[PDB]
Structure formats: C-alpha cells, structure tokens
C-alpha cells in the first residue's frame, strides 16, 4: 500500500475528515436536529441548565419561579421563598426574612446549536408574573434579538450562537421563553400541508434535560465537553467541536 | 396656549385618548396577546391562578392532582392525599382517612382576554382519570362552551369573558383544559403556509404563570388590580380597565 | 461559593478619633496580614483613604 | 554573563539569600509579628489549633469549656457535656452518663514563634473553675515556664520553640492561658511612653484564627506546612522553613 499521508490512497484518511463533515452537514438538513441551552447562573457559582432538542423549531418557556435555584435533597426555605415570591409579584405583597433571595439568577446564557437561523431566534424576557411589556395591552409577545447572538467558535468554525445578560439589578426579576427555527435554505416550507403533521410530531418528540450543577468548571467538564456542546465560559473562552472538512 | 379643555388644542388631551385606544386596539391586533386564566377556589378561601400569555391561540390543560390546593412550605398530608388520588380513581381504591378532601377544588373560573374570539373557545371538562366524557371510545375531545361565557365589562367597554361553574358535590372530580384563538376578522389564516411557523414558535414562546393567593381580596389587590387584568369576584363585582376612546 | 461570605466591608470611626492614628490588620482566611508571618507588617495605616 | 553558581557574579543567587535572610530578620525587628499556637489534641486523634498574632506581645487564654472538642455540624452531646462540667466543677455536682468525656483534652502543646523572647514566656495553667493554683488567695497569677520549651530546629535553624504536656489523667482537668513578649535586645522599652499606645493598639489589632482538624496528618499538610509554621508531631519529627542565609 501507499505509505499514511503522502499521497491520494490515505483512504483512512479521508474516510476520517468524511465522518466529520457527514456528521456537521446532517445536522444543517431538515432531517437534523436544532437544540437551545438557558443557563441561569446563582450567586453560589452554581448554574442550572434546561436543554431542548427537536426537528424543524425548538424552544423553552420557564416562569420568575421555576428559574430560581432549587439544591435537590438539601433545605430551601420553601417557605420564605413562598414569601419572596409574593414580594416580587408585587411591592410589599410578601412577608419574607430577607431583602434578596440568593435563588435569583444573577445572569442568564441563551446558546443555540449552529443548525438555528439566527434571524428566526424570539425571546419573550418578562416581568414575574409573566407579561412581556408592562401590560398585555401593549405586549408584543416577542423580540427578534438574533442580531445579539455571537458566534461560538473554534478552529474558524461556527459552533453554537451565545445571547449573554446579566441581573445583577433589584429589579432584575424575570421569566423567560426563546424559540429558533432550524436552518431551511429549500423553498420546500416544513409546514405546508405535506409536513405540517411531522412538525406537529416534532412537538411531542422534543427531548428535555434539566439539571443545576455545583460550578461552571463541572458544567464544561462533566455537560459541554462529553456531549460535544457549544459553550461561552465567564473568561469569554469558547468551546465546541470543529468538524466541517476536518480530520 | 389655549386653555386645557375648552378647545381642540388640547393636544395633552387627544394624546392621552390616543394612548389608551392604541392599547385596546394593538391587544385585538394579530400582533398582540390573547390571555387565559383558570381561578381554582378552596374551602380555606384560597385561590390557585393558572394564567398563558401568548400569540395567535392560548390554552391551559391540568390533571385532577395539579388542581388539588398545594400549599408551598407547609403540611399537605402529603402521603394521605396519595390515598385520596387512588380513591378518587376507582372507587374505594384508597385507604384514605377522611371523607372529603379539602384540597379538592370549590369552583373554577375560566377568563379569556377581550382578544379572544368566543366563537374559538373549547373547553375538555375530564373525570380524575382524564377521559372528557366517561370512555374515550365516545368522547368528543371537547365542547364548544363560548355561548356560556359572561361579558366582564367597565364603563361598557368589554374587558374579558367569564365561564364560572361549582364544583359543589361530592362526585364532581375533574381533570380540565380549555383553549382560544386570538380574535382575527381578516381572510390573512395566522396558520397558512406563510406563517405556520411563526404559530409553532408561539407554542415555545407562551408564558406561564401560577400562584395560590390566601383570599379572593389579595387575589383583587395583587393579581388582578396590578396588571389590569378582568376579573369577576363572588359578588358578581367586575374588574378591569376601559382602554377604547377613553382618556 | 458560600454566599455567607462577606461582598463587602465598611469601616467607620466616630469624628472624635485622629485619623493619622487608624491602624487595619486585612488578613488572609488563616489570619495573617501578608502572605507569610516572617514577611507580615501587622498593620497598615490606611487613614489616607478614609 | 558569568555562568551560574561559579562566581560572586550570581546576583540571582545573592538576591535569593538576602530575600530568606531578610523575612527572618524582620521578624526579630520590633516591626515584626510574634505568634503563638495552642494545639489540644483529642482522643478521637482531631486537633483544636488556636493562632493569635500580634506586635510587641502576645497570647491565648481559654476556659475549660472552650478547650472541650466542638464538632461544628455534627452532634456534640451538648446537654449531657453541661452536666459533665457540673461534675469537673465540683465532685458529684452533674447528672452526667459517662465516667470520662472523650471532649477532654488529652494533651496541649504551645509553640511561639521564634521573634518570642522565651524568658518572658507566662503560663496560667487554672483548675477547672479558673482558678491559677487551688485558691485565689495563695495563687501567683502565672509561671515562667520557658527553661521547659525545646527549640524545634530545621538544618540547625530555630524555627519555633515548644512545650508540650500530656493530660493522661482523669483528674487533668484545666483552663490555660500563655503569654510572649517579642525579642527586644535593644533599651528602647517599646511600652515606654513614646509607643505605649502602639502597644495598646496592638491589643486590638491581634489577629486570631481557631480551627479543629481530623488528624495531626492533615494539621501537618494543610495549616502547619503551606504557612511556613514551625511543629514537633508525636514521632519528635520537627517542622518548619530554615531562613537565615539560605537559598
Ligand atoms: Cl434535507
Ligand atoms: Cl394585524
Ligand atoms: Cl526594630
């Protein structure tokens, strides 16, 4: 045989860079998926991750309560939490033992996977009790915010879409929705009457993940690196897998 | 200047008139929100609301459990109302100890949004086990109730609908879900092949709200007052903000 | 991170005190003033910034 | 350049000897810190360390309770160990249900610095009720025990000095308190009128650190070791950092 690269016969060789550009293409196809991250990141450096993956469009729609940190098996204060929400609701509505609650996010992180089109991406960012704008009179039910998303890359390659706000504010009391659209450059519509009832599908297929990790360390080591995930750390770091055209 | 209100030049005037009608009318516009509510009532006085927030169709669908009263950092016999759950199932298949379980719903009230077209409201009134009408074999999946929903009105403008049933009888257990589409007097289908996904997406991008308030009064004072919501108390008493030419 | 760890610290002195006497032992969390005890100042007179 | 370690070019070299010489003067300078440790070692093989640091003078003075072993987050015996100090107090004055409680100390060792001046070493070794020598009326308020401290040594350095007493018995039941005055070779009497307020404020500017360790192991590797402290284990072996003209 050929002696490994040196000439056109490293079959092995591109068999390789093949494995990798078929994976980072399948994902682009209306057959692939397209998946978004929020991060709502804790004052304890602990930060809670809501993944969904799904065909054709995918989205997250969390209430001011769910965001805020929950340590499974240990003590809460599930009681002044009760109280803390009430005074969120509403100035001097709550009875709560303390001025900020700890279980408030500081910042959130929406990251999308590189098979979105950023010009599709929606978040609904609202107040505690879950209205857009100040009054649903005058709620838009969304913002178009994809022209905030940054490129997540590595090796020149595209790997994920990062939207990063802080909360570090009093006032800083939200509930959150976002939605992208998976990639179609086709004139062929994945909801005309053909394929409606697959994108209905697709609503029920969508796989959720939820869990809070103790540190960002864990979360790059022990969620982002195994799963080949896009992430922007707090030192402004990227990670991911370049895989287009590439051994 | 002239004098404020003695002449057309009351500019101050016409732009506060103008403010509040933009408000009513971009609400019944297909950019704007249609809104549901579902006022679970307990024996103790409290009131659980469930309200979605969101574009183009809105609705909400809870188990027989997720109605049950839950009160956040206190006892809710928890092991107990296990048993009552089997019993409410089949009958005498718990070995519950109590006749009647106070966590049990008193009433609901349904609220829509004035941008919600009635003729759109469905209604799936479930037994504990969520079958719509006793075997799913001849079961409707639901019923069309909007004839029944009263106009929540102020100053003669209509600010939401009311669809208010007792649940007063030992026998009435129910799982429930209800829907409505946002109001469209246009031949522009918010769900043809141009804008399908958008109505997708409006599915990721709902928001959520819950809370069990202690009284219908805190109910009036820090739910429905704030956010100029409609409303209808025990009374027959109307809540709510007339927007539509007024100043 | 403990969230029971101070964000911050103030100091203040009634306006009876002189300043230029204001003496702050800032220790490392096994309560030694720079780094090492053979090295250590015990103090640094931070009137200065008050 | 000259090459290394052949000449008395090696600037390197001189200024690494002179910054160790320096860190070991200044601590004799009356600029510099005098320390002193109080280790009580328990049955359970744990370590109480108690640190004071200060200017000029310094020292630890403890109750027989505060020298008892407190296991922070765990269950300590907290009523029976108050009705065991009823019983050191006075013979048969406690309700205690043990004959020896494994909170006793079983042996001291004090270690100062070597900025320490050893004749001006005091020790008030009390009874349980704090009292120096069995009665008030005939008590010396302390003994000057420095001709007992051993030098701890590293390479023929002084490092620190030691005194060490085992409490075997079940009538060694003490509170304790010592006391250093740092190295002064010149006349200038640094409690003289000139800096007698320095002296004061060093009183408030002493800084304490208490901390009780699983092992004399872990004492040895995470508080005696990375602070550069001298300390003599059970197996005579001595520890500590030789400074005076060395690399
Ligand atoms: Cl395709
Ligand atoms: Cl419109
Ligand atoms: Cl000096």
Same mark, same amino acid.
């Given at each position: 045989? &050929?002696?490994?690269?040196?000439?056109?016969? &490293?079959?092995?060789?591109?068999? #390789?860079?093949?494995?990798?550009? /078929?994976?980072?293409?399948?994902?682009?196809?209306?057959?692939?998926?397209?998946?978004?991250?929020?991060? +709502?990141?804790?004052?304890?450096?602990?930060?809670?991750?809501?993944?969904?993956?799904?065909?054709?469009?995918?989205?997250?729609?969390?209430? %001011?309560?769910?965001?805020?940190?929950?340590?499974?098996?240990?003590?809460?204060?599930?009681?002044? /939490?009760?109280?803390?929400?009430?005074?969120?609701?509403?100035?001097?509505?709550? !009875?709560?033992?303390? %001025? *900020?609650?700890?279980?408030?996010?500081?910042?959130? #992180?929406?990251?999308?996977?590189?098979?979105?089109?950023?010009?599709?991406?929606?978040?609904?960012?609202?107040?505690?009790?879950?209205?857009? !704008?100040?009054?649903? #009179?005058?709620?838009?039910?969304?913002?178009?915010?994809?022209?905030?998303?940054?490129?997540?890359?590595?090796?020149?390659?595209?790997?994920?879409?990062?939207?990063? %706000?802080?909360?570090?504010?009093?006032?800083?009391?939200?509930?959150?929705?976002?939605?992208?659209?998976?990639?179609?450059?086709?004139?062929?519509?994945?909801?005309? +009457?053909?394929?409606?009832?697959?994108? %209905?599908?697709?609503? !029920?297929?969508?796989?959720?993940?939820?869990?809070?990790?103790?540190?960002?360390?864990? @979360?790059?080591? *022990?969620?982002?690196?195994?799963?080949?995930?896009?992430?922007?750390?707090?030192?402004?770091?990227?990670?991911?897998? +370049? @895989?287009?055209?590439?051994?």
């Amino acid at each position: 045989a &050929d002696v490994a690269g040196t000439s056109n016969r &490293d079959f092995r060789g591109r068999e #390789q860079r093949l494995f990798n550009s /078929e994976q980072y293409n399948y994902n682009n196809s209306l057959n692939g998926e397209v998946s978004v991250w929020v991060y +709502a990141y804790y004052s304890d450096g602990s930060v809670l991750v809501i993944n969904k993956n799904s065909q054709y469009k995918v989205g997250i729609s969390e209430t %001011f309560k769910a965001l805020k940190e929950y340590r499974e098996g240990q003590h809460n204060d599930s009681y002044d /939490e009760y109280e803390v929400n009430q005074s969120i609701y509403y100035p001097n509505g709550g !009875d709560a033992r303390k %001025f *900020h609650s700890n279980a408030k996010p500081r910042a959130i #992180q929406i990251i999308f996977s590189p098979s979105v089109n950023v010009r599709t991406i929606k978040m609904a960012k609202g107040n505690a009790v879950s209205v857009p !704008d100040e009054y649903l #009179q005058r709620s838009h039910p969304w913002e178009a915010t994809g022209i905030k998303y940054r490129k997540i890359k590595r090796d020149g390659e595209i790997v994920g879409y990062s939207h990063y %706000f802080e909360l570090p504010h009093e006032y800083n009391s939200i509930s959150l929705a976002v939605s992208g659209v998976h990639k179609n450059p086709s004139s062929y519509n994945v909801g005309s +009457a053909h394929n409606v009832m697959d994108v %209905f599908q697709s609503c !029920d297929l969508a796989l959720r993940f939820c869990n809070r990790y103790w540190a960002e360390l864990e @979360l790059v080591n *022990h969620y982002i690196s195994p799963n080949a995930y896009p992430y922007l750390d707090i030192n402004n770091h990227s990670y991911g897998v +370049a @895989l287009s055209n590439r051994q």
